[PDB]
Amino acid sequence: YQAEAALLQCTADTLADAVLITTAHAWQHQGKTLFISRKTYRIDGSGQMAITVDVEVASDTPHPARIGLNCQLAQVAERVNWLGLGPQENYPDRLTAACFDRWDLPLSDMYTPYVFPSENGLRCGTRELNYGPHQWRGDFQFNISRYSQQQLMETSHRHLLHAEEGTWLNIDGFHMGIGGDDSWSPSVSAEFQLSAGRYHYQLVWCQK
Amino acid sequence: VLQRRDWENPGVTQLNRLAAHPPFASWRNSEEARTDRPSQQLRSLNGEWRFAWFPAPEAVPESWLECDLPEADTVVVPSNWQMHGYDAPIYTNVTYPITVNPPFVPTENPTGCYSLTFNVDESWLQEGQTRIIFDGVNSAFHLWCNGRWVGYGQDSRLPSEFDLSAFLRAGENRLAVMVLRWSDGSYLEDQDMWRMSGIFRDVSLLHKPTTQISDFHVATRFNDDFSRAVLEAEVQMCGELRDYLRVTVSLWQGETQVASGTAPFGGEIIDERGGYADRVTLRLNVENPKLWSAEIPNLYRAVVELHTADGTLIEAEACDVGFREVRIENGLLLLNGKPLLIRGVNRHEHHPLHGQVMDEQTMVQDILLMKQNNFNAVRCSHYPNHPLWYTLCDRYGLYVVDEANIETHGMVPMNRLTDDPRWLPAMSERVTRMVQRDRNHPSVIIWSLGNESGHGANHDALYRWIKSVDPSRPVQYEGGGADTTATDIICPMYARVDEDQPFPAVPKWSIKKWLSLPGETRPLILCEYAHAMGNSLGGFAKYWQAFRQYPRLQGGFVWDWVDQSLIKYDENGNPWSAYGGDFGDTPNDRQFCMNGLVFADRTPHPALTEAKHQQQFFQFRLSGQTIEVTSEYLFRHSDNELLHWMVALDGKPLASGEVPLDVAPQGKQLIELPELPQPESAGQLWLTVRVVQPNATAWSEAGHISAWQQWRLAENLSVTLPAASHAIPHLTTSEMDFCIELGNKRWQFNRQSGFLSQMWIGDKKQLLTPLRDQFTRAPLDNDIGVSEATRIDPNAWVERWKAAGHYQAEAALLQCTADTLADAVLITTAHAWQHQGKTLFISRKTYRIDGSGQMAITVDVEVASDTPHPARIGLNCQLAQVAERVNWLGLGPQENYPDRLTAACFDRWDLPLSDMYTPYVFPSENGLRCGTRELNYGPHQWRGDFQFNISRYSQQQLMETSHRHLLHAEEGTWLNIDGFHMGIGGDDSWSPSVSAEFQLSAGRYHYQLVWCQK
Ligand SMILES: OC[C@H]1O[C@@H](SCCc2ccccc2)[C@H](O)[C@@H](O)[C@H]1O
Ligand SMILES: [Mg+2]
């Protein structure tokens, strides 16, 4: 929760028909490196931005809850449209009931109002997501809402949450299971833990 | 004799054959019996005999009974006559090698005529009884002595004895033996093995006195905690009963007499008519007996003496006694009150030069290798063994399942003969004579009614016969669905751990589910599992996890110990390994005769090390700095055991140490490690522990490793940049090629194919073939199954890959571009693999060549969801150079695959190029190493996270060649580097058996390599 990103590399290059940005970051806590991410951004003449991500996780840190990107978008739209598992909230070890199709819901149905606030509203197996003028394409899991992960963690009751300016988007290449064999001891099975040490995913961000 | 045709009549299995009994030597001195010295009363007739071969028994001339044929050769006995070139051995699995028409056999019935001239001593003919013993003859035979007919025998795997007292004369005597290849007994001997014939075990003469010991049985009973035993010995005599006759039984431990008893003949009253006048039962008390087990094979020696009341010895007999108790209680098989875990293997009697002739030296070699690989049990598949085998298992310590010679696999339905009462006589001789021969051996713990003969009323009758004559051992039988009323143990073959196979009438449930079916209470021990054919034993760890977690899963017997290949010679007289069909035998079952963990010359396959590790007797757990050691021994303390530990950072040793093990049977020991070093340098730290035996044993050398395990400790990720180079690579663009130069190095990319087509260091070309994607492997035996060109099996992996076009698919270029960055050159390619308009795979690659001279390759592959999952996703090329050594940092040192890699350890390994090839007799994909981070070969170095194989043989040549002796080294070296590789399977080899977690089914894959010159 406390680890600070330190820049290792940030370079730019003009190719024939595109611009390529390359970055690398290390996340540290008291001298220990927890994660490294290496990214390329390729912006071509069609106006698409292709993002490639490669992450390494130290074998002796506890497996992380997710590996993804987040940002706060400036705009609020009424509807979310996606091609992926739906229509309800689904997670990697609770997604048999969800079906793959084109789904379309108001932004408020993308938030599950649990009385004790937590991570909520994820959709898995997603190939395309549309929100306002933006479109993301890939093979990912996402959640979209007016509440940051920080605000959900600090607030003990759903009536004390307030909508933030704009919309918080989380796009994950990988997400850990939620468990539930019991709630008083670790219960996420070994096949749902992010224990592989190296991960790779890719996204295209465009304006359609 | 030619008009009765006894070999075509299941009602006649013998004429004039003597009763079965335990092994006898007829000593005439009690000390010679006690110390097991050779007996003058037992002569071997093994050596040179005369032999003639005939196409049928009607072709044997009548003069052969009186005198030697001039056209006979001299041959060694024991032998199989197919091993001397007289006719071809036949390898068939299920189909009978003759027309199925019981009880008739072909009129063309190859016949072997053996003869021997021999002297008999004068002293042998004045007094007593002379008998001849044939330990095994295949398949039926008639015997003559000095021209006169003596008798007839069938059942190839148990001894046949005949009285020769009335036929022998002083001086020169002649035996004549006529052996038939086929008989009605052949219908009950359809085991999966080479079909051979001849006098293939020992021949001997035994002299007994007229008043003699004719049988004896030994039984042991215990109190609740095994602190007091009663040895009960029943002795029977033949000949004239006299009042002065006495029997003494004594029990020896080494040179110390421990117990003794003496009685006159006359048993207790049995029924309204009295008792046995010609039997006696002695009871001997033994306090604190040393118990026999496979861990500690403590033996006593029992001597039985027939003597007169005034003390004159008539004859002595002896055997080894082991005190142990085997019972089933509350659904568990117990030995000496503790539950067994069977580390078993199936073993055939097979030698590559001598066929089915077993010698002592071969038997001892098999037993030492078994114990050295953590096996404790052996199944006699599928017939009684040579009598010396049970003696060696008693002395060294292996549990034995002894099996009757009955298998009728090729019948339709499988129980056609075993449900018929006309075959009940023939089957009962095979079961009752085995029990009368072997019931005194401590190593025999379970009887088996035979193999693969369905379930018939004859099996129930014989199950109940054994329970009544020998209540001290359980009975098992697998036929008719493995859990019938004719078995004490559920004993399936090839049931899977988690997956059901619901066949009609005879389903194979998953073993965990079978245990809990409504009503079921018996223990479960697999009589055959993990078919080891070729490159196999994938998923072996999954059986051993289940065996340790479930009490009623008590282990199993691997199929099987040794490959049944034979030796043939080429034109230059060089030996090669041959299999079904290589002798002109037809029909045949080709390479299905090679299922062993060892090659026929007793050299190990790579799967042997996976078996050794899963079967270890010590289990380990790591918690912080503490190792917890658990013993899985039932009876011994760890008194010959030292734990070595070593910590290494990416192959480099940092700390080491030893600790003595002191752990009680089924106990635990905690070992605390010293404060481990904290290095600053990047990389993963690894801890390896190994259990070493400092002293030699009967079965192992000083320094033998019996158990090991490896864990990851702390990791430090590398956060330093590559050193900024001054030089920039130069790009030259022609119409045909992109060419990149830096210093003396040069790379060339072909613009029509889109592959790296050549690389130079100085002026020396490095490649003979372009670096290309590869999605296929030379198919393993488990990929092919029972599929053949005549009869295609559409469900096998090789058939799915062929029908879909994976072997034929052509790469089509979609894109090939080049760009100069600031400090590097970047090449981008894309290819599609097609077959008849369908796209199977797409690969997108980037090559980045920087100023340090490194080439970084990124690969992204898509696989169509409806094509069968590919065997691998990787690159291949043929390098121009041949080097002596391969050095790698990864799992090793032996061949390992994604579902067979628990036994391999991560370290720095270094081997000659030839150890990177596994010479399976049927060629296939082989030699892979997984989990690899760095590979060095000549001047080249590859870095990444990959699996590789390196050799002189292409995947194409391995797929097209049927025998390892026909392979030839290609120019240069074939390298395969895979991001991903499918599992090898091996639950069985005749249906798909690669588990879902080992299939490449994710649709999208990514991997990266760096290729440099260090
Ligand atoms: O080593 C082969 C194995 O074959 C299978 S039959 C099914 C496979 C098969 C059938 C016919 C020809 C070849 C293989 C047996 O059940 C095993 O005991 C073992 O003998
Ligand atoms: Mg069979």
As a three-state string, the secondary structure of B870-904 is CCEEEEEEEECCCCCEEEEEEEECCCCECCECCCC
Q: Are strands B399-403 and B377-380 parallel, antiparallel or unpaired?
A: parallel
DSSP state of B747: E
Structure tokens at B779: 């198919």
Residues B29 and B156 in one domain: yes
Compute the distance between CA of residue B484 and CA of residue B455 in angstroms, rounded to an integer.
8
Distance from CA of B822 to the nearest CA of A (A): 7
List chain B residues with CB under 8 Å of A18.
none
Q: Where are the beta strands (DSSP E) in B676-744?
A: 683-693, 704-716, 730-733, 737-742
State in Å: Cα B522 to ligand 1 middle.
27
- Report the run of H or E that residue B346 belongs to, with start and end: strand B342-347
Whether residue A101 lies within 8 A of chain B, CB to CB, comes out as: no
Distance from CA of A116 to the nearest CA of B (A): 35
Nearest to B666 by CA among B636, B706, B709, B639: B636
Is B595 annotated in a binding site? The answer is: yes
Whether residue A20 lies within 8 A of chain B, CB to CB, comes out as: yes
List chain B residues with CB under 8 Å of A200.
1006
Mutate to test the pocket of ligand 1, among B989, B990, B993 (most ligand atoms within 8 A of CB): B990
State in Å: Cα B990 to ligand 1 middle.
8
Compute the distance between CA of residue B520 and CA of residue B484 in angstroms, rounded to an integer.
11
- Boundaries of domain holding A32: 1-208
**Which ligand 1 atom is the nearest neighbour of the CA of B560?**
1
Q: Are strands B148-153 and B14-15 parallel, antiparallel or unpaired?
A: antiparallel
Cβ-count burial of B462 within 10 angstroms (0-12 exposed, 13-18 middle, 19+ buried)?
buried
Structural domains in chain A (count): 1
Is B862 annotated in a binding site? The answer is: no
Mutate to test the pocket of ligand 1, among B95, B526, B560, B592 (most ligand atoms within 8 A of CB): B592
Q: Where are the beta strands (DSSP E) in B181-255?
A: 193-195, 198-199, 203-208, 212-222, 228-238, 245-253
How many alpha carbons lie under 13 Å from residue B875 in its C-beta half-sphere?
25
List chain A residues with CB under 8 Å of B844.
none
The closest ligand to the CA of B492 turns out to be 1
Residues B491 and B639 in one domain: no
Indicate the SS3 state at residue B516.
coil
Beta carbons of A60 and B719 less than 8 Å apart? no
The distance of Cα B805 from the centroid of its chain, to the nearest Å, equals 36
Indicate if ligand 1 lies below 6 Å from the C-beta of B91: no
- Report the run of H or E that residue B218 belongs to, with start and end: strand B212-222
Structure tokens at A34: 């927890």
Q: Are B806 and B797 in contact (CB under 8 A)?
A: no
Compute the distance between CA of residue B478 and CA of residue B487 in angstroms, rounded to an integer.
8
Is B528 a known active-site residue?
yes
Indicate the SS3 state at residue B469.
helix
Indicate if ligand 1 lies below 6 Å from the C-beta of B506: no
Query: Could you identify the residue written with the tokens 């001397």?
Result: B84
- Report the run of H or E that residue B614 belongs to, with start and end: helix B607-614
Q: What letter represents residue B356's amino acid?
A: Q
Q: How was this structure determined?
A: cryo-EM
Structure tokens at B345: 């293997």
The closest ligand to the CA of B988 turns out to be 1
Catalytic residue among B452, B478, B799, B895: B452
Indicate if ligand 1 lies below 6 Å from the C-beta of B192: yes
Q: What letter represents residue B327's amino acid?
A: R
Q: Are B313 and B211 in contact (CB under 8 A)?
A: no
Distance from CA of A208 to the nearest CA of B (A): 25
Q: Are B690 and B705 in contact (CB under 8 A)?
A: yes
Domain end (from B324, B358, B376) = B324
State in Å: Cα B411 to ligand 2 middle.
11
Buried b / exposed e over B934-962, threshold 16 CB at 10 Å, is: bbbbbebbbbbebbbbbbbbbbebbbebe
Mutate to test the interface with A, among B717, B816, B820, B1006 (most CBs of A within 10 A): B717
Beta-bridge partner residues of B631? B618
What is the residue with the minimal CA distance to atom 20 of ligand 1? B192
Q: At what angle do helices B360-372 and B387-396 cross, to 10 degrees?
A: 40
Residue B676 CB coordination number (10 Å): 14
CA angle B152, B158, B164 (to 5 degrees): 45
Q: Are strands B256-264 and B212-222 parallel, antiparallel or unpaired?
A: unpaired
Distances in whole angstroms, Cα of residue B989 to Cα of each of B378, B478, B801: 22, 19, 17
Residues B706 and B788 in one domain: no
Residues B949 and B851 in one domain: yes
Distances in whole angstroms, Cα of residue B795 to Cα of each of B495, B800, B867, B993: 19, 7, 14, 11
Residues B168 and B251 in one domain: no
Query: Could you identify the residue written with the tokens 């190994």?
Result: B690
Residues B387 and B523 in one domain: yes
Residues in CB range of B192: below 8 A, 6 or more apart: B93, B94, B409, B589, B592, B593
Residue B630 CB coordination number (10 Å): 14
Beta carbons of A56 and B821 less than 8 Å apart? no
Whether residue B1010 lies within 8 A of chain A, CB to CB, comes out as: no
Compute the distance between CA of residue B911 and CA of residue B739 in angstroms, rounded to an integer.
35
Residues in CB range of B509: below 8 A, 6 or more apart: B492, B495, B500, B501, B517
Compute the distance between CA of residue B163 and CA of residue B154 in angstroms, rounded to an integer.
17
Q: Nearest chain B residue to A15 by CA: give it.
A: B819
State in Å: Cα B94 to ligand 1 middle.
7
Whether residue B945 lies within 8 A of chain A, CB to CB, comes out as: yes
What is the residue with the minimal CA distance to atom 4 of ligand 1? B93
Query: In chain B, how many H helices and how many E strands?
Result: 12, 58
State in Å: Cα B546 to ligand 1 middle.
25
Q: Is B455 left (phi over 0), alpha (psi -120 to 50) or beta?
A: beta
Kindly report the length of chain A: 208
Nearest to A36 among B713, B719, B819 (CB): B719
State in Å: Cα B93 to ligand 1 middle.
6
Interface size A-B, in CB pairs within 8 Å, comes to: 33
The closest ligand to the CA of B526 turns out to be 1
Residues B82 and B225 in one domain: no
Compute the distance between CA of residue B808 and CA of residue B776 in angstroms, rounded to an integer.
10
Q: Are B266 and B280 in contact (CB under 8 A)?
A: yes
DSSP state of A180: -
State in Å: Cα B506 to ligand 1 middle.
16
Residues B104 and B222 in one domain: no
Indicate the SS3 state at residue B369.
helix
Beta carbons of B719 and A198 less than 8 Å apart? no
Compute the distance between CA of residue B477 and CA of residue B281 in angstroms, rounded to an integer.
32
Domain end (from B687, B706, B721) = B721
Cβ-count burial of A2 within 10 angstroms (0-12 exposed, 13-18 middle, 19+ buried)?
exposed
Residues B43 and B175 in one domain: yes
Compute the distance between CA of residue B291 and CA of residue B325 in angstroms, rounded to an integer.
9
The distance of Cα B348 from the centroid of its chain, to the nearest Å, equals 8
- A window 22-51, beta carbon within 8 A of B: 26, 33, 36
Q: At what angle do helices B607-614 and B540-549 cross, to 10 degrees?
A: 10
Q: Nearest chain A residue to B1004 by CA: give it.
A: A139
Residues B217 and B204 in one domain: no
DSSP state of B996: G
Compute the distance between CA of residue B161 and CA of residue B22 in angstroms, rounded to an integer.
12
Distances in whole angstroms, Cα of residue B650 to Cα of each of B140, B681, B946: 65, 10, 16
Mutate to test the interface with A, among B622, B687, B715 (most CBs of A within 10 A): B715
Residues B61 and B75 in one domain: yes
Whether residue B715 lies within 8 A of chain A, CB to CB, comes out as: yes
Indicate if ligand 1 lies below 6 Å from the C-beta of B94: yes
Nearest to B406 by CA among B387, B386, B380, B388: B380
Catalytic residue among B403, B478, B528, B641: B528
Header resolution in angstroms:
2.2
Beta carbons of A8 and B719 less than 8 Å apart? yes
List chain A residues with CB under 8 Å of B979.
none
Indicate the SS3 state at residue B185.
helix
Compute the distance between CA of residue A65 and CA of residue A175 in angstroms, rounded to an integer.
6
- B window 805-834, beta carbon within 8 A of A: 817, 819, 821-822, 826
Most distant CA pair in chain B: distance in Å?
114
Whether residue B1006 lies within 8 A of chain A, CB to CB, comes out as: yes
Beta carbons of B819 and A60 less than 8 Å apart? no
Compute the distance between CA of residue B669 and CA of residue B652 in angstroms, rounded to an integer.
29
Residues B372 and B285 in one domain: no
Compute the distance between CA of residue B692 and CA of residue B706 in angstroms, rounded to an integer.
6
Nearest to B54 by CA among B70, B72, B66: B72
Query: Could you identify the residue written with the tokens 């074939």?
Result: B974
Beta carbons of A26 and B717 less than 8 Å apart? yes
Residue B879 CB coordination number (10 Å): 19
